[PDB]
C-alpha cells in the first residue's frame, strides 16, 4: 500500500489525446509452501524434504494488481515471488500435525524451529540493535571544535517505523572565542547551516516575542535569554516568511537558478516535509513543529547550562532491538521498489506498441525470490550489485553442536558499531541492562562485549496502535498546544507520545 498506484500518460498528437494508464495494487495472497519438480509435478512440501533435497521452505506469493486505462481528450492474482517461512511460525506446515505426525514426518519434537532453510543450510537471523527513534539526545563535542553541544534526533515515520531523516542542532561558539554563541541548525537536503531564528520565522513565528516565549519556559533564566540573544542579534536582517524561505531555498542543494518563482515553494516543501516527518506532513500544523523545535532548543541549552546530564548513549531504554520482522520488512521494501520500477519500465517499452500486456511476461518474480535467497544465503543484507557497503553477517549457519548452543543462537543480539577504533563505552556493561540481557554470556576476542543475549524473561515489543491511546488522552481532557504559552501553563504537565509532543495537561497524577 505504500505506493498503491502506477500512473502513465500519453499526450499523443499526430488530434490531441491524453491517455492515462493507471495500475493499482490491491490485496496480497499467501500460500503454504509447495514443491514443483522439473517434471511439472507439484505437491505440498515439508521441511525434512527440504533439508534432504537442498530446497527452500518458501511460500509463493500472489498479489492483486489492477490494470486501468483513462483516456481523456483534453489485474488479477499475480505471482510476485517466494518468501521463505520460519519453521513453527503460523504459516508453516508443522504448526498443525501435532506431535504424532512429526515422528511420521521425521522432525524431532524438540527442535523449536524459529529459523529458515535455504539450499539445505539452516540459516538464522541475528537480531540487530539500533538507537531509539524520535528521541532527543545531547552530546558535547570535542574541545577542538566550535561545536560545543549537539542535539541529534533521528526521525522515522510511525507507520512502518523506517528511517526518514536525521537532524542536528549545533551550539556554535567557544568560551570567549567565536564571539557570540550563535546557534545554527542543520536541515536535510542542504549544504549549509541556518540560524535558529531564521527557521523560526520561515515556519510562521516571524516576531521575536513568539520566538522567545516558545523557546523559553523559564523567563528568570536570564542565561538562556542572553545566550540566545546573539541569534536575535543576527536574526534581524530577516523579518518575514518570504526572505527567510528564500534564504532556506537559496541553499537548497538544488540546481542553480530556481529563482524566487519556484525556490520559495522548494523551501516550503523542504520545511513541510523532510523535517520532523514523524510529527506531521500537512499544512496548517506548523504549530506542532515550532513547539517541538522550542522544546529541542530548550533542552539543548539546559544541557549547555549544565543543569541536567547529557543522556547516556549506552542507556538501554534509548536502545531498540530489530527482530526478523522489521529487517525482512526493509529488505522487502527495497525489493518492492525494484519490482515497481521494473514494471514501470516494462510499461514504458511495451505500451507504446499499445499491445495489451498479460501482467505475466512483465512481472519478473525472479527478482524477489533470487534477492531474498541470496541475501539469506550469504547474509549480505542488501542487493547483490552493492555487496560492498552492505551490512554483513546478519544471517549465519545455525549451530547445533548441542541443544543449549542452538537455544542460545536463537536469542543472540548484535551491535552495528564495527571495530575500527576500539573504545570501551559500547562494549562495556551498563546498569539499565538489569534483567534484560545476560550479565554472564558473551564471546571472546574482537566481539567481546558486542554480542549480547536476552535474559530469561526478556520480551520484545511488537507494537500497538496509538490511536486508541491518544483517543483516551483526548478523551481525558488533554489540552492541545494551541492553548499553550510559557506564562499560563508554567506548571502544567507536557505530554509526549512515541517521542512526539502531543498536548498539554495540568493535573497529571490522576491521568
Amino acid at each position: 500500500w505504500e505506493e498503491p498506484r502506477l500512473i502513465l500518460d500519453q499526450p499523443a498528437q499526430h488530434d490531441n489525446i491524453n491517455k492515462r494508464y493507471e495500475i493499482r495494487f490491491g490485496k496480497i495472497y499467501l500460500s503454504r509452501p509447495t514443491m514443483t519438480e522439473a517434471d511439472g509435478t507439484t505437491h505440498a512440501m515439508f521441511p525434512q524434504e527440504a533439508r534432504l533435497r537442498n530446497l527452500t521452505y518458501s511460500s509463493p506469493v500472489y498479489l492483486d494488481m489492477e490494470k486501468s486505462m483513462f483516456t481523456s481528450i483534453d489485474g488479477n492474482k499475480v505471482h510476485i515471488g517466494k518468501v521463505p517461512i520460519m519453521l513453527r511460525s503460523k504459516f508453516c506446515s508443522l504448526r498443525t500435525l501435532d506431535e504424532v505426525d512429526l515422528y511420521k514426518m521425521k522432525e524431532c519434537p524438540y527442535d523449536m524451529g524459529g529459523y529458515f532453510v535455504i539450499n539445505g543450510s539452516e540459516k538464522v537471523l541475528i537480531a540487530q540493535e539500533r538507537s531509539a527513534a524520535n528521541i532527543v539526545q545531547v552530546f558535547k563535542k570535542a574541545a577542538p571544535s566550535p561545536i560545543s553541544h549537539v542535539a541529534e534526533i533521528r526521525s522515522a515515520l510511525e507507520k512502518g517505523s523506517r528511517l526518514i531523516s536525521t537532524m542536528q542542532i549545533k551550539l556554535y561558539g567557544r568560551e570567549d572565542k567565536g564571539t557570540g554563541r550563535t546557534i545554527k541548525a542543520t536541515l536535510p537536503y542542504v549544504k549549509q547551516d541556518i540560524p535558529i531564528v531564521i527557521v523560526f520565522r520561515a515556519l510562521g513565528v516571524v516576531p521575536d516575542g513568539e520566538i522567545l516565549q516558545h523557546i523559553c519556559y523559564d523567563e528568570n533564566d536570564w542565561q538562556m535569554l542572553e545566550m540566545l540573544k546573539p541569534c536575535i542579534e543576527e536574526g534581524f536582517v530577516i523579518q518575514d516568511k518570504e526572505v527567510a524561505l528564500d534564504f532556506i531555498g537559496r541553499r537548497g542543494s538544488a540546481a542553480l537558478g530556481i529563482r524566487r518563482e519556484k525556490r520559495i515553494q522548494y523551501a516550503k516543501d523542504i520545511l513541510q516535509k523532510e523535517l520532523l516527518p514523524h510529527i506531521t506532513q500537512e499544512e496548517g500544523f506548523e504549530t506542532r513543529k515550532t513547539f517541538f523545535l522550542g522544546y529541542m532548543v530548550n533542552r539543548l541549552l539546559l544541557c549547555a547550562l549544565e543543569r541536567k546530564d547529557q543522556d547516556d548513549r549506552d542507556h538501554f531504554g534509548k536502545k531498540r532491538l530489530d527482530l526478523a520482522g522489521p529487517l525482512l520488512a526493509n529488505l522487502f521494501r527495497i525489493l518492492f521498489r525494484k519490482l515497481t520500477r521494473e514494471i514501470y519500465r516494462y510499461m514504458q517499452r511495451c505500451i507504446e506498441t499499445d499491445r495489451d500486456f498479460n501482467l505475466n511476461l512483465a512481472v519478473k518474480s525472479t527478482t524477489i525470490t533470487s534477492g531474498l535467497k541470496y541475501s539469506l544465503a550469504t547474509g549480505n543484507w542488501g542487493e547483490q550489485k552493492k555487496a560492498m557497503s552492505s551490512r554483513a553477517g546478519v544471517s549465519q549457519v545455525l549451530n547445533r553442536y548441542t541443544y543449549s548452543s542452538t537455544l542460545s543462537h536463537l536469542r543472540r543480539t548484535n551491535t552495528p558499531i564495527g571495530r575500527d577504533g576500539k573504545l570501551a563505552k559500547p562494549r562495556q556493561l551498563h546498569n539499565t541492562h538489569w534483567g534484560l540481557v545476560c550479565p554472564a554470556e558473551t564471546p571472546e576476542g574482537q566481539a567481546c562485549g558486542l554480542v549480547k543475549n536476552l535474559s530469561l524473561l526478556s520480551g520484545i515489543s511488537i507494537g500497538s496502535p496509538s490511536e486508541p491511546i491518544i483517543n483516551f488522552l483526548e478523551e481525558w481532557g488533554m489540552e492541545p498546544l494551541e492553548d499553550y504559552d510559557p506564562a499560563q501553563h508554567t506548571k502544567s504537565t507536557r505530554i509526549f507520545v512515541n517521542g512526539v509532543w502531543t498536548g498539554i495537561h495540568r493535573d497529571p497524577s490522576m491521568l
Binding site: 576500539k422 570501551a424 562494549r427 562495556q428 571472546e444 576476542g445 574482537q446 567481546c448 562485549g449
Partner: protein
C-alpha cells in the same frame, strides 16, 4: 575482559614498531655499535 582484549593488540603493535626500528644495529669487532650504514651509536656497547 575488555581491558585485556584491547591491550594485547596495542602491545603487539608497539613491539613490532620497535623491532623494525632497531633491526639493523649490530656489534662489530672494533667494539662499536653501528647500524647498516656505519653510523656509530655506542662506541662500546652499553658503555661496558
Amino acid at each position: 575482559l575488555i581491558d585485556t582484549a584491547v591491550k594485547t593488540a596495542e602491545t603487539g603493535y608497539i613491539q613490532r614498531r620497535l623491532v623494525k626500528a632497531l633491526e639493523d644495529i649490530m656489534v662489530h669487532y672494533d667494539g662499536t655499535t653501528r647500524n647498516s650504514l656505519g653510523d656509530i651509536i655506542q662506541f662500546l656497547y652499553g658503555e661496558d
